[PDB]
């Protein structure tokens, strides 16, 4: 009826009070005894060229060698980052691709974008020619992110304020996750693939479990759209970069803000966020044409990655941590070590 | 070095040959983004310019051997501050207005696309659509144009351009006053990098001419001749 607004406000006030009671003192008083990381220098070991338009997303393969990249020219290019050798160059049905993924087995590769559909291509097939194997449709808004659980199912997040879990062989939606008010911009899958997180563009992040399918936890600390999200290596935390030129860190059990990576000189928002092998380095992409390398604990911007002539769009660290890759809007992929 | 000899020749060389083959095709086409409200009649424009040539619709048309791909966004939510960044490097943006309450929203939308960070340097072709409806409405007399915009009351014809067809000054005055509002919002900011080309609404030739002007202006800017 008309009395539900005040009851919901009281419930949210109770949530705020319970969160406040769970906080004892400022975090800066606990991590001030740790050794500062120092200063990080990265240099471009190799730059992968060949894309025409701006690169919008890219994903490392399970092996630390192969890596797929999606560009708005309509191309999905697979590189062997060791020798800068291209392996496949798949043309796309729709040139407006906003996300791409690499299957954990390396057999399949997913893509999607403004056409609201997710395309699954098979790499290791007869005659060695890449052909489309599945076209999952059903999302209303533009498909913003997609991540493989295995060769059988893939999780997608679209701009219609929804996420979904698919079924490649059947082609239908096994389950759908709703609750976000703005468009979901990025999703990150836990290492166990039992839960994932969605950073929608409503200054809110949500945690879902794929087996049942309701929002377990909701975190609201940012003040603008969340553009990127990624799990901590242990799976018990995650970092969200937003459009207010801030990164933040969340812990599921704590259910609170932990770290707030920001600086006065930083003006443009965050485009991509990824962690490192140990979780001691958070790499973030910015509209200022460069990436930054924060410390998870110290939170003082240890390193800077400069050399991109346009906006940095995609970021990704391999599973073994031996390299990082940055794809920018100047149609360039850069490998750093 | 023989294990990665064929693994390089068969893959990288052929893929680069294909990439060079389709790069010239990509560069030889002009990508346009079609914008407009649900009552702007942009679909009629699409059909009109497509007959003689789910999340997004593509309309490939070519005028005197120049290829144009026009993208009309459909089956999308109203919140469009996010996917609008995709059209960063389109050659032009087509804006269609139903100039016939309704004009304030269209003016604000054009203002918003004008000042966006990612659309700062991309010019816009303005289509003041539905001219016959505007003429009939202004000649009708029941609908007053000066109450939605009091500035029209103290307005005079710009006299820089003339109405070629035989029509009374009232319709010309209203039709140029709406264009004046749009052009004032356009020229308030955004100087040098991008411009706006207004047309009262064939359209294929208009789009071709404005794209030619845009490309020539950009090329002359690269030579510091403008």
């Amino acid at each position, epitope marked *: 009826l008309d009395q539900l*607004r005040q009851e919901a406000e009281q419930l949210k006030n109770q949530i705020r009070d319970a969160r406040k009671a769970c906080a004892d003192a400022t975090l800066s008083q606990i991590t001030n005894n740790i050794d500062p990381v120092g200063r990080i220098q990265m240099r471009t070991r190799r730059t992968l060229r060949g894309h025409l338009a701006k690169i919008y997303a890219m994903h490392w393969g399970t092996d630390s060698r192969l890596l797929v990249s999606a560009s708005q020219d309509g191309k999905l290019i697979i590189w062997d980052s060791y020798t800068t050798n291209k392996v496949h160059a798949i043309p796309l049905r729709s040139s407006w691709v906003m996300t791409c993924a690499y299957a954990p087995s390396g057999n399949y590769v997913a893509c999607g974008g403004l056409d609201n559909i997710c395309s699954i291509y098979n790499l290791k097939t007869r005659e060695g020619n890449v052909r489309v194997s599945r076209e999952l449709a059903g999302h209303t808004g533009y498909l913003s992110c997609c991540r493989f659980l295995d060769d059988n199912q893939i999780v997608t997040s679209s701009g219609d304020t929804t996420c979904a879990l698919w079924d490649i062989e059947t082609g239908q939606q096994t389950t759908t996750f709703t609750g976000h*008010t*703005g468009d979901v911009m990025s999703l990150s899958l836990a290492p166990d693939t039992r839960l994932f997180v969605s950073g929608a*563009c*409503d*200054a*809110s992040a949500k945690l879902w479990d794929v087996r049942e399918g309701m929002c377990r936890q909701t975190f*609201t600390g940012h*003040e*603008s*759209d969340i553009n990127a999200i990624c799990f901590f290596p242990n799976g018990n935390a995650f970092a969200t970069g937003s*459009d*207010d*030129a801030t990164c933040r860190l969340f812990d599921l059990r704590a259910d609170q803000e932990l770290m707030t990576y920001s600086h006065d000189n930083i*003006i*443009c*928002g965050i485009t991509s966020v990824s962690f490192s092998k140990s979780g001691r380095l958070l790499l973030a992409g910015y509209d200022d044409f460069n990436c930054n390398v924060w410390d998870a604990l110290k939170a003082d911007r240890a390193g800077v990655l400069a050399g991109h002539d346009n906006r940095v769009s995609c970021l990704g660290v391999t599973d073994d941590g031996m390299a990082v890759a940055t794809g920018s809007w100047d149609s360039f992929l850069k490998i750093w070590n | 070095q023989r294990n990665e000899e064929k693994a390089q020749r068969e893959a990288n060389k052929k893929i680069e040959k294909q990439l060079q083959k389709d790069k010239q095709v990509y560069r030889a086409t002009h990508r346009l983004l079609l914008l407009g409200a649900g009552e702007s009649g942009k679909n009629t424009i699409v059909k009109q310019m497509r007959i003689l040539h789910s999340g997004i619709f593509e309309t490939k048309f070519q005028v005197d051997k120049v290829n144009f791909h026009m993208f009309d966004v459909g089956a999308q*939510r*109203d*919140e*469009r*501050r996010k996917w*609008i960044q995709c059209f960063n490097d389109v050659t032009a943006i087509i804006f269609v207005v139903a100039s016939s309450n309704r004009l*304030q*929203a269209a003016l*604000k939308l054009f*203002d*918003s696309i*004008w*000042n*966006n*960070k990612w659309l700062r340097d991309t010019s816009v072709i303005l289509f003041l659509n539905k001219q016959d409806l505007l003429a009939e409405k202004v000649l009708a007399g029941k609908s007053k144009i000066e*109450d*939605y*915009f*009091p*500035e029209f009351a103290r307005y005079t014809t710009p006299e820089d351009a003339t109405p070629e067809p035989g029509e009374d000054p009232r319709v010309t005055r209203a039709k140029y006053f709406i264009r004046d509002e749009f052009l004032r919002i356009s020229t308030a*900011s955004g100087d040098g990098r991008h411009y706006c080309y207004p047309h009262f609404t064939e359209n294929i030739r208009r789009v071709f001419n404005d794209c030619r002007d845009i490309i020539q202006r950009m090329h002359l800017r690269q030579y510091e001749l403008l």
Partner: nanobody
Framework: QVQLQESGGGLVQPGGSLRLSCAASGFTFSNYKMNWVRQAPGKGLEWVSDISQSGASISYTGSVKGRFTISRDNAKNTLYLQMNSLKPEDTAVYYC?????????????????????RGQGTQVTV
């Protein structure tokens, strides 16, 4: 979470005067551009007025071009719209609206049907 809450407005005769003040919480007010939107019965959202980053550049619609006063107070963290010479057609529900991004002079989806950083609205009836 972001939170905008506006002072209400009671029923007044045509030509009356009121005041709609909305207070903000959860963000740096001084770093954002704030607009007004109103929803009339049987009508969609329509933007009314706006305030620049520093509070200098202002703009109105034709209907309220010379009837309403728009202002913002950073210290009190509020934005006010003082209404003068009201009309029966101004009866609507008023929401303060926020630019989705800081540091920018323009933004979209302020008048959207499901915009996130919009207030609950006050019923101004004439």
């Amino acid at each position: 979470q972001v939170q905008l809450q506006e002072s209400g407005g009671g029923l007044v005769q045509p030509g009356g005067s009121l005041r709609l003040s909305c207070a903000a919480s959860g963000f740096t007010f001084s770093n954002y551009k704030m607009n007004w939107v109103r929803q009339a019965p049987g009508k969609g959202l329509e933007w009314v007025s706006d305030i620049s980053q520093s509070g200098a550049s202002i703009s109105y619609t034709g209907s309220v071009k010379g009837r309403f006063t728009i202002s913002r107070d950073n210290a009190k963290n509020t934005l006010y719209l003082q209404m003068n010479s009201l009309k029966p057609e101004d009866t609507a529900v008023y929401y303060c609206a926020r630019c989705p991004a800081p540091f920018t002079r323009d933004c979209f989806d302020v008048t959207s049907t499901t915009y996130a950083y919009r207030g609950q609205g006050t019923q101004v009836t004439v």
